[PDB]
């Protein structure tokens, strides 16, 4: 179905990069597929994505070279979740506040509706991490991996729309983290 | 018609997203029309807006589906008030401040002149539609504790009233920021 | 000379709007002319100035109608000063701090090169504020008006330059207020 | 290759400005070229760069006037390092946290990958001395802080414009890492 699926990957890229959620070649995202998952390639302009940039990976056995080193996680996520899409990103604020929480609870109405609760995993990538990210995403739509960015899942049926669902949730996270940070600097200091 | 009005919905969309005032899909914005008010479709990239992403909603009763979930809040503001444009956004700092403040009173000229005092609502529904469509009469912007902020548009032309409401929106945020930096500075140094 | 001059006003207005330094309708900037000065019109979309959005004001008596309500301030500055351009904006962080200080001292090298020292006049756009802004602009290149905004002077011989030069100093003040803000929130909230 | 190489300085200046990493005219950036190095001119709106806003400069001899005031520093860096592009900006949060650090150490994954450790140069006084300090600093590091006067980021790609785009990229990373350090410290100084 290339046409539209493509529209969603190039879109999300340009977006995740315009909002600062990822640098020029960081982060990765994927959708589920008959074989396995369709992912972005390692080390490449994620805002200037083109078709040959995406690469199908199976849940099977050989991880083809050129596919994100974060590919282990995505897979595990697809192997133990029902997730139909996954966006990995680095929302500045969410990441700064992740160093002190085990959980991140949004205060805002939009956040509480979609990101009810965001778990923070402490590593003390790696297969091990893959399993923690995986478990967290079973009953949660996003999670922070301490100082390692966040992960958001998409459960919609249409691969592309799932992707927008994820990227979308990522954006909600950062918004909630920002609101949490402001709300505190104010309550705290000052009077 | 569908030339200057579209451009304005698209612009407010792109800017609102870049300015960090909303999420990919959060928020909504409307204009007063002959039938009632035109609004953004619910569920859709506000930053990649199209003519198809909007539609009219009579003040009557038939709220077509696709219209924002908050049309109920827009309508009631178009019923009991002289509004002509309406932006619903999520200014981060302002929202932050909400939880605490009862009213937002800018300490800055640009603010003090156009957003004299921004009351904070604590609702939830029909209940909130009202709360807002009252406050937006004597006031041009209101804060829904934890949800967001509504900014009023008043120009004759539709497009203008919208950008004006979007204007007041960025002003709302800049005032919250000022308030906030103000506090963090004289209160820790 | 209109041409280049015009481009300058249109440019300063656009950048100022982009940089967040003025809302679409506020602020104002002028350049000195043989007559008096050339200032933006009252209430006009600064980011889309047209050659007809600018009006000439003499240093003497009758201020044409349509002029910015603060032509008084600009004129009081061109009367008592060598200023050859004047930019009036609202740098949010610069204003936020102006409430508690009486002088702003850039901690940064660029700031300590032009904005050497930034005074803060206190109320009590009036003829009083103009007179106060005009003298303060005699030994300093910029000044804050508590609650209001900031004033930056330009001095190049070419009006077009002076403006860019004033617009830019405005840019320099905000960089500084921010450096100040962050420096303080940091050194102050840490150990 | 002018074409594309121009598309780089142009985007960089635009981004550096919109990103908040430079005043309307501060900063300077460049790419190593056959003879010596290509660099931004002096006193030019970095946000509106034209092809005529850049000058060549040999590694030895008469620095043509009009070139960046800090061309000496660039020249030093291309003589004593394998730099291929250099961006000198003014990250705000980063400068603020530099006034009392000696080194800046990113707490975030991404920052730790690229900018392992950013040294903060901080002179007292015993130009080319500083130009030799930045150079030495940038030999083993890809980014360095110059207390109260911004940072320096290096590009190592073979294609020049890719190197420039690369160092600008590092620049954002630095500022994002400083911000993460900050919010991490402010959020902590609460409850």
UniProtKB/TrEMBL annotation, chain B:
GO biological process: one example: pentose catabolic process
Keyword terms: Lyase, Metal-binding
GO cellular component: cytosol
Pfam families with a match to the protein in the record: Aldolase_II
Keyword hit for Lyase: yes
Residue span(s) of domain Class II aldolase/adducin N-terminal: 7-180
GO molecular function: aldehyde-lyase activity; metal ion binding
Protein's name according to its UniProt entry: Fuculose-1-phosphate aldolase
């Amino acid at each position: 179905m290339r046409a539209r699926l493509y529209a969603a990957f190039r879109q999300v890229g340009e977006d995740l990069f315009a909002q600062g959620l990822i640098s020029a070649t960081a982060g990765n995202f994927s959708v589920r597929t008959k074989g396995g998952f369709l992912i972005t390639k390692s080390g490449v302009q994620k805002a200037r994505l083109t078709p040959e940039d995406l690469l199908e990976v199976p849940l099977e056995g050989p991880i083809p070279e050129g596919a994100s080193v974060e590919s282990v996680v995505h897979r595990e996520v697809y192997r133990r979740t029902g997730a139909r899409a996954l966006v990995h990103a680095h929302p500045r604020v969410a990441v700064a506040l992740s160093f002190h929480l085990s959980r991140l609870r949004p205060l805002d109405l939009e956040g509480q509706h979609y990101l009810k609760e965001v778990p923070v995993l402490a590593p003390k990538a790696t297969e091990e991490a893959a399993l923690s990210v995986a478990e967290a995403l079973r009953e949660h739509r996003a999670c922070l991996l301490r100082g390692h960015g966040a992960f958001a899942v998409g459960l919609k049926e249409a691969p592309e729309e799932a992707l927008l669902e994820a990227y979308g949730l990522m954006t909600t996270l950062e918004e909630s983290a920002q609101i949490l940070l402001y709300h505190r600097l104010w309550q705290g200091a000052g009077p």
